Amino acid sequence: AMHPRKDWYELTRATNWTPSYVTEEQLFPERMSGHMGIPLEKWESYDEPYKTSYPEYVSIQREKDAGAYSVKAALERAKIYENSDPGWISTLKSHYGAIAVGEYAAVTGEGRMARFSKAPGNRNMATFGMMDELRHGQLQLFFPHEYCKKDRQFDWAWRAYHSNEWAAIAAKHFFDDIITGRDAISVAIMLTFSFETGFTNMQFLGLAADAAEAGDYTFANLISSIQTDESRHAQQGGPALQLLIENGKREEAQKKVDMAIWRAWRLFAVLTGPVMDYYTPLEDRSQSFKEFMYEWIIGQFERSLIDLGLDKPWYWDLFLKDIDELHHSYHMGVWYWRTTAWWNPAAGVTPEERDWLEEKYPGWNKRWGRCWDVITENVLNDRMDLVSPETLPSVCNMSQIPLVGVPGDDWNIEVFSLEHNGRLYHFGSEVDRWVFQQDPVQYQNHMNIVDRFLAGQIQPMTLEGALKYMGFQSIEEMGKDAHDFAWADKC
Amino acid sequence: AMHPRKDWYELTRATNWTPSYVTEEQLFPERMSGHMGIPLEKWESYDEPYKTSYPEYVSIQREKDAGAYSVKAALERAKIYENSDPGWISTLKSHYGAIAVGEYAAVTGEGRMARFSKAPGNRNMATFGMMDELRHGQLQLFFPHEYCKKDRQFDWAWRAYHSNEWAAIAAKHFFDDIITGRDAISVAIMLTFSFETGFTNMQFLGLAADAAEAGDYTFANLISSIQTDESRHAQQGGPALQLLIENGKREEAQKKVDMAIWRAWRLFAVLTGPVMDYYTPLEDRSQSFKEFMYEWIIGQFERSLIDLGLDKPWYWDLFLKDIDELHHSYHMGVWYWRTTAWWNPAAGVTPEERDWLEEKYPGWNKRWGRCWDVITENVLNDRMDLVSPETLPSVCNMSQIPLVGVPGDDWNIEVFSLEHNGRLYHFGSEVDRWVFQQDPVQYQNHMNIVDRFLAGQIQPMTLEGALKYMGFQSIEEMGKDAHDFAWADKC
Amino acid sequence: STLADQALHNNNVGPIIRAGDLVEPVIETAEIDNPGKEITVEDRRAYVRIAAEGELILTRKTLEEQLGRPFNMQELEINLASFAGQIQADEDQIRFYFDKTM
Amino acid sequence: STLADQALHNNNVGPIIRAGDLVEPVIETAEIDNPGKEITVEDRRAYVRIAAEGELILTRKTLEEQLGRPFNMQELEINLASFAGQIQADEDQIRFYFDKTM
Amino acid sequence: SFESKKPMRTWSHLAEMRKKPSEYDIVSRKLHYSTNNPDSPWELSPDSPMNLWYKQYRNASPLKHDNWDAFTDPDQLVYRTYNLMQDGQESYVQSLFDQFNEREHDQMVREGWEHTMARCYSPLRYLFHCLQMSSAYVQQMAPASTISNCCILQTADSLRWLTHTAYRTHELSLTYPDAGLGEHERELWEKEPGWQGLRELMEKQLTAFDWGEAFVSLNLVVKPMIVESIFKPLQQQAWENNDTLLPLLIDSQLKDAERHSRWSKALVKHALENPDNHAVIEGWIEKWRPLADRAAEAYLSMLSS
Amino acid sequence: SFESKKPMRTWSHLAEMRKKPSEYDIVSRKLHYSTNNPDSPWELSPDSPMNLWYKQYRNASPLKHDNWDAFTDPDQLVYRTYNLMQDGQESYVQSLFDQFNEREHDQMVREGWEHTMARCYSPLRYLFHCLQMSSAYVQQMAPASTISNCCILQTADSLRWLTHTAYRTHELSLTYPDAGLGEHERELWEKEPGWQGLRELMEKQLTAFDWGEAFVSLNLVVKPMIVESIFKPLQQQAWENNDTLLPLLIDSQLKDAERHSRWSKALVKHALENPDNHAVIEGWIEKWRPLADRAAEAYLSMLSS
Amino acid sequence: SAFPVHAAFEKDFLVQLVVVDLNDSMDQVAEKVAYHCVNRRVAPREGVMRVRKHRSTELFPRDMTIAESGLNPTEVIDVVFEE
Amino acid sequence: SAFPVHAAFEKDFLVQLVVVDLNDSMDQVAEKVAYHCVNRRVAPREGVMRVRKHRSTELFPRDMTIAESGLNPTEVIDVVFEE
Ligand SMILES: Oc1ccc(Br)cc1
Ligand SMILES: Oc1ccc(Br)cc1
Ligand SMILES: Oc1ccc(Br)cc1
Ligand SMILES: Oc1ccc(Br)cc1
Ligand SMILES: Oc1ccc(Br)cc1
Ligand SMILES: Oc1ccc(Br)cc1
Ligand SMILES: Oc1ccc(Br)cc1
Ligand SMILES: Oc1ccc(Br)cc1
Ligand SMILES: Oc1ccc(Br)cc1
Ligand SMILES: Oc1ccc(Br)cc1
Ligand SMILES: [Cl-]
Ligand SMILES: [Fe+3]
Ligand SMILES: [Fe+3]
Numbered sequence A, B: 001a002m003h004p005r006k007d008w009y010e011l012t013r014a015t016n017w018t019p020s021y022v023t024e025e026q027l028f029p030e031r032m033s034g035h036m037g038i039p040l041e042k043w044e045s046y047d048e049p050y051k052t053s054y055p056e057y058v059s060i061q062r063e064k065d066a067g068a069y070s071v072k073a074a075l076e077r078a079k080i081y082e083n084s085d086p087g088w089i090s091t092l093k094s095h096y097g098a099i100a101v102g103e104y105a106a107v108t109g110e111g112r113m114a115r116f117s118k119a120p121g122n123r124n125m126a127t128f129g130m131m132d133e134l135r136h137g138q139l140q141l142f143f144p145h146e147y148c149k150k151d152r153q154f155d156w157a158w159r160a161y162h163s164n165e166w167a168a169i170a171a172k173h174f175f176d177d178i179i180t181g182r183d184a185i186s187v188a189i190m191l192t193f194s195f196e197t198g199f200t201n202m203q204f205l206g207l208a209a210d211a212a213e214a215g216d217y218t219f220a221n222l223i224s225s226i227q228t229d230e231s232r233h234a235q236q237g238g239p240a241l242q243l244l245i246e247n248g249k250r251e252e253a254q255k256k257v258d259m260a261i262w263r264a265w266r267l268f269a270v271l272t273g274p275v276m277d278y279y280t281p282l283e284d285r286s287q288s289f290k291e292f293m294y295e296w297i298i299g300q301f302e303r304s305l306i307d308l309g310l311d312k313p314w315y316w317d318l319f320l321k322d323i324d325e326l327h328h329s330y331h332m333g334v335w336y337w338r339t340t341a342w343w344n345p346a347a348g349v350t351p352e353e354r355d356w357l358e359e360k361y362p363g364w365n366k367r368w369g370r371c372w373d374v375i376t377e378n379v380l381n382d383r384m385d386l387v388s389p390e391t392l393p394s395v396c397n398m399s400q401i402p403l404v405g406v407p408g409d410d411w412n413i414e415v416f417s418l419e420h421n422g423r424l425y426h427f428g429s430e431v432d433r434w435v436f437q438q439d440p441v442q443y444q445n446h447m448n449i450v451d452r453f454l455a456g457q458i459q460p461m462t463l464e465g466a467l468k469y470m471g472f473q474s475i476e477e478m479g480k481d482a483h484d485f486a487w488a489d490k491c
Numbered sequence C, D: 001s002t003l004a005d006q007a008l009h010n011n012n013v014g015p016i017i018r019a020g021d022l023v024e025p026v027i028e029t030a031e032i033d034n035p036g037k038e039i040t041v042e043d044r045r046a047y048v049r050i051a052a053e054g055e056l057i058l059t060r061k062t063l064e065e066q067l068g069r070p071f072n073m074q075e076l077e078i079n080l081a082s083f084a085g086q087i088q089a090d091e092d093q094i095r096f097y098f099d100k101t102m
Numbered sequence E, F: 001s002f003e004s005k006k007p008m009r010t011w012s013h014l015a016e017m018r019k020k021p022s023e024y025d026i027v028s029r030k031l032h033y034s035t036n037n038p039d040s041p042w043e044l045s046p047d048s049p050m051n052l053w054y055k056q057y058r059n060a061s062p063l064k065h066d067n068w069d070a071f072t073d074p075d076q077l078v079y080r081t082y083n084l085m086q087d088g089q090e091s092y093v094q095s096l097f098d099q100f101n102e103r104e105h106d107q108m109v110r111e112g113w114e115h116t117m118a119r120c121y122s123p124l125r126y127l128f129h130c131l132q133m134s135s136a137y138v139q140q141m142a143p144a145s146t147i148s149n150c151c152i153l154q155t156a157d158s159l160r161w162l163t164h165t166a167y168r169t170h171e172l173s174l175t176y177p178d179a180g181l182g183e184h185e186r187e188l189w190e191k192e193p194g195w196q197g198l199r200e201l202m203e204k205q206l207t208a209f210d211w212g213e214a215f216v217s218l219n220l221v222v223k224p225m226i227v228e229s230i231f232k233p234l235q236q237q238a239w240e241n242n243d244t245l246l247p248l249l250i251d252s253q254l255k256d257a258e259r260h261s262r263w264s265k266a267l268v269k270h271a272l273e274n275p276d277n278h279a280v281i282e283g284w285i286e287k288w289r290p291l292a293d294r295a296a297e298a299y300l301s302m303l304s305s
Numbered sequence G, H: 001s002a003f004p005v006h007a008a009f010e011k012d013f014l015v016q017l018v019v020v021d022l023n024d025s026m027d028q029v030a031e032k033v034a035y036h037c038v039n040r041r042v043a044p045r046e047g048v049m050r051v052r053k054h055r056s057t058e059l060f061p062r063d064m065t066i067a068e069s070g071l072n073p074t075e076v077i078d079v080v081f082e083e
């Protein structure tokens, strides 16, 4: 006979002890632990709601991978690369590049917890979380690797995090802030709670629905299997939050959640936003970016956050306005400066798409449409010099993404600037400025790509010099219009 | 026969015309008008909900004053000055000083509207508002004047706004920002809507209830008659807000409301807070400061603001926490530095009061009570040097009130600092810093009393030098403990 | 904030009448002119807060009867210290009301 | 924000099941194990969002019957892509639930 | 050191007065704290927009005096006594309106008078509102509270006259519904030649932002012209056309106008204690008088045609 | 200028390899971007707390090499193959647990063995969790992903051993409910002399923050001691006390331990390509060995008493 | 005497780095910004381009140079059209 | 070599202006702040007073002077007790 896990599970997490040969603070230093002075004894109350055990984990994970790899192997000849709309191919390229090596960096967030968390259940669940992120890093290198021989832009699945390309710096500045650059408890709250229960569902399930509509089952099957792991290890955050609140640290907990959600939001608006409303073929758009936001972030995540006893973030109304607006501008910038991307942005502004955009975001044509009208005219008249940039965008010193606003008929744009230690910084929102002021030692001496350009670090100071600095190795790697402007024929 | 006002009222506000000999912008300059580019024609839709006409106004106002003065005359021999608890007398002294000449400054806010508003109904209602504030200024000089011959601290009903005393600078920095220092539309929204429908009910009706419990009917009758005027002229703001929203200026309107509410709040916490929970005798406390806040600001004002289509301010949760906390600290500071006030603060910490405080603010004794325990010990042991200050408090560069936090068992204090044009500023909240960043040209070269002290403007640099700078003219005028420490006998 | 949320989520409208000869006549009038609305009254000695859900009407004619002397609607200003709700007022009555339901 | 307020004010709980052999068995099981709760299903092709108000139980025993093959509760992890509500799970069942009512 | 001092019988600023302070003195004197600090009128950044406006259009006015605060309204009106006085005047006017309406006064005016009213009387609501707006401006800019208080009451008087005009415009339209009474006044103010001199004068007066020039152009040029060239000529015309109500109404409005003239002249007397002010005042009167003169001439030719 | 280049058959960093890249190479190699910029490991302010931690305890380690990334796990394990291997091993262990329980193995151990288990075996859950925590630390600090991957799998193995111990502690308590099995292990770890050398060793090893010293103290000192002085002696004692399950369980755990020894030795071989590393490694071994020795001595005397 | 500013052009969707000259007039600043906006993402139109500090009400005079303006390098300006 | 700081003392209700000296140690800074807090509004207690930049985690060394600290005049410090 075997004994059920409930009868012996407590012993697997009876691992806290009273140190004697070193102090508690030497063994769990606040800079790496983030216990906020809460004593060890209080951490034994931590109770992970989504448990597993070693023998179950290896058995189940063996099954998960056997299915992911089997489906990939079976569909190799389905001609996704050759037959898919190029905007769908650019979606894969952007996903693997923005994600693969970030998953592997998440191993380190989980390791920070496995060593430095004072909660014994957290240390064990983080050990499984370490393994999960290893899985995800290895899957999302293995899957795009077969496309290396087709297209050098697939090399960026590996290369992106090793470059100074603008989107890679935006990703690393975010992941290094929430995942690898803070104490274990900050990781629990910012990564496992805020990011992994909140935003990743957009990219790993939201996008999966579009992938299935697009007939790319290898990819939809892969990313939904990955999210099954996230659903487990993401449940490390809630119990940590509950404990912090119980021990008089609600305000500190709330501030960490509010900061992580905003930082995550600006990044998803630049990656997932343009994918969902522009790169994905109109016929495959399961829901709009905003509709998916309302399902996953508002209906699901925010409701969970309220159930746990936290408050809506101070900037809630700002956030909602941003959902209607930000990514349309981000898409425009990514497309206009496409040569600096490692994927091929699709413009997504054929009349049929513009009608969908108008239905999903009433007022769209009088705003962003005004800019696309000028761009479309230039493309039709073959004035191509006017469709490529000859200067840099101004860039947020938090998000590392350009400073944007609403264009067209009710033009409004606002930059939020700050002097700090004899330096002028610029932010894309009140909230990004606020994040900086929350922890200036984290950020103060960081230089964004524009700051580096102005400081002489990028030589020559030309578009070409910037491209070489950003890590581009051949003419083929630079982003182009996905359809080589064929969309203009429909205008 | 006479014709009813409804049949001829429209003609009293058919006063907009199309200028020809000067431009519309010359006649209504944006810096004084604040029309935000909204054309004249759109302002004719403005419809004041609380109308009157000249012949009704003079008749009704004649009656209002005949009652206020008759009651004062009839109760002159009631011995309020001699028989009232000295904390009640200090409440009168603080009220008249903080208020009388501010009412008269409000004439100018209403005049700014009567000349520069593009809405014809607003210009006429502001003309009555000009008259109303004249009334209030004149009443609140006339009423305390009889006490000049009893007590020089009553001279401050006239003198306060002419001084550099700390509370007078806090009042003038606020009223000059919301009343006299901005365009007509800013006045409509910040003064008539935010301040006059929101906060003044606390001081003119909240306090009136305490005055009636205290048996001071001259004062309760006076301030409630004054608020009858406010209820009319305060209704200028709502229609302006509705129009701004209709004409695509919701965000600008919302920001102005959010700024004015916060600025008003910090001032009421310093004046009305200590009055309601400490100076007013325990037996006369109709409700606590927090209870009155929940009735007037949350239940009444915020519900009105939502009905008009605005949103709860971004800082709502901060505000609610502040209600539980801020004024206890402000009271402590005003009492500790009492010598710099023109009234006599009552400590309000006898055991019976401390029990009420604990009931109204659970956790009070473990926080502020810790400080009062030390103070009380010193008073009992006649260590009086330890009950008077030998340095300055640090002061907010927005509110002009000291930087405070929660003391005692869960000590927490936070200063929000800012570098701007080579100068370091300090604020008492995230919101006060935010207000500064909203309009730095309004504030940047202002120096608070501490800034002036450090710059050599206050000579000698001593407590006595500071007192002379603040306008004190005799030893009797400086604030003392209201009960000359008799409260310690109950401890 | 549970307390604050509940404080905010009201639809209470009505006059706040300062102490004096209009207090009882206005309470009586609120009852008469809003049949089938419950009227709530909070007495704060210097003023009384009189409310109903969503809408509260005071008619000049009823107020005159309850007060017991000739009364013109504009005279209520002598004693109307504040009010909850938006206001609509003419020679015949005053309506306190909200557009929204919370 | 009217739209956002209404989106937030839900008490929906339940599994999000990725495309595969568990979709229909879980929908069937949700119906059977929560008699007298309405079950809502939103089909997004790559996943299905299955919900009930306040609480949704899945029992191993019912799931095994609906799936048609031997099944241990931990196996649901292969196909549980996400979930709404807090989770309580053991060898016999899984409960999705909220503490609060919005 | 701080010395002991006894309670004063009145405010510290009045404690040296010879005579016992009046109600007027106690509630009206030295209330603008915005004149205390030349470098920042208002308790804000010294270069804030409204600080700069006040430093430019009040502090730096050519009209100069070392004690504007010493100015005294010759009528010594306070809010309380103003309402007592005006309630009496308005009650009288309302009683006239009531009785004249009972007698059907409007029915018996000379043939065609309703048309003269529609053209020369009812558009005065525009002119009167301009006086109202302009009075409010001198209120907010004047460098002493005792001056500003005169302006506040003057603003209220201008609204009084506007309201009389509105009421009577409507009333007259009831007897004469086919004269455009209450319908065509804006068109007339904007396009009728007789109104153009007036409208040009006021649009320019309203854009004179210096407090001294504002006061002089309004109170010493515009307002005496209205008494001479509008109020009195209308009374004359009403008498020739059997309108016996209009002369009585205008006589009540003239009591207001004569009070505005009294405080204006008291202010001139106070200002001329500084010899420099004679040239400053004279030059503004000469700058503004031709606009005023052309205003009056065009109106009278419209009225007498 | 930008030249045209053809697609590569593999990642750009592997494109020069002689042999076709394996699954291991593709998914494991050169993934720490945090080693690219010596002045800021992480994409934050170069003086942020974690940048300073990494510059101090990784970059500035005395253990030095110009290409840590070239390190190769001799077993070339990836997540997929690790789970295949361990699912086989764990299935075997679960099958042993099931069958031995059916045979009532625990009932037939020598008299008193349950007490030796309660004292010498069940508190190992503490020691094993320390190995787990420590492996996680070397993972997060190691300067190549191929080293870190060995540490991740080693962390998982340490949790495997902890879990075996928990399961068997509970199971044994069912036959022997009066030996404090599952009740007194923390007290023993904290106060029992035989555990004190071990607990002192691990508390100090866990506070060695230099990645090289962490690796050497954990993998070259602590872990070989556990094989020699804990695992093998327990198998011997189990055999003398008719516990036939424990030797079989320990043999499965020893396969893990021998794999950790293999990658550790491969790393030493790679590090010793730099002659400076011999003295660095030797000196850390000499620093740590006496604590390890005293750990082992106290344990064995507890076990054999 | 290169002078970097961050410039937001009326009706455009972003702020861009534009490198102007210390002795450029506001008229010349406006033209250099427009190069990177008008006919790229912003439709051409009649009127006069003016320069202000970002979010300001006050426009700089057209003939004023950037050195005379007191602007600092990397400050944000708007380029808008007179109403 | 007067040096103004703004100082928040542990358990007190406010931040105060305290004028220290450029060459004061953190130990001496702590004492000068405590003068204005301990036995006025804060109960005396055993332990060692330490100085940090306001809201910081890092304490300055006890022997470090304010000149060596890199603090600027009018910056905010906390004075707290070692745990
Ligand atoms: O490269 C870019 C990305 C986003 C924007 Br917005 C502009 C440029
Ligand atoms: O000169 C440059 C033009 C465009 C970019 Br992007 C960078 C440099
Ligand atoms: O976010 C960025 C987009 C483009 C450049 Br160039 C720099 C940053
Ligand atoms: O004078 C003071 C007023 C308030 C505080 Br808090 C401190 C001092
Ligand atoms: O030296 C001083 C002490 C206290 C104050 Br308040 C001002 C100056
Ligand atoms: O708000 C203040 C209180 C006391 C002083 Br001293 C200065 C400012
Ligand atoms: O028309 C009105 C009647 C009464 C009041 Br109170 C307000 C306005
Ligand atoms: O114990 C569990 C059973 C099933 C799941 Br899914 C998670 C935990
Ligand atoms: O202004 C007016 C005075 C009395 C009446 Br009746 C009408 C209007
Ligand atoms: O770790 C374990 C493996 C198998 C069983 Br049965 C129990 C525990
Ligand atoms: Cl903010
Ligand atoms: Fe992952
Ligand atoms: Fe994850």
Ligand SMILES: [Fe+3]
Residues within 6 Å of the ligand: B103, B106, B132, B133, B136, B230
């Ligand atoms: Fe008032």
Ligand SMILES: [Fe+3]
Residues within 6 Å of the ligand: B106, B133, B196, B230, B233
């Ligand atoms: Fe008012």
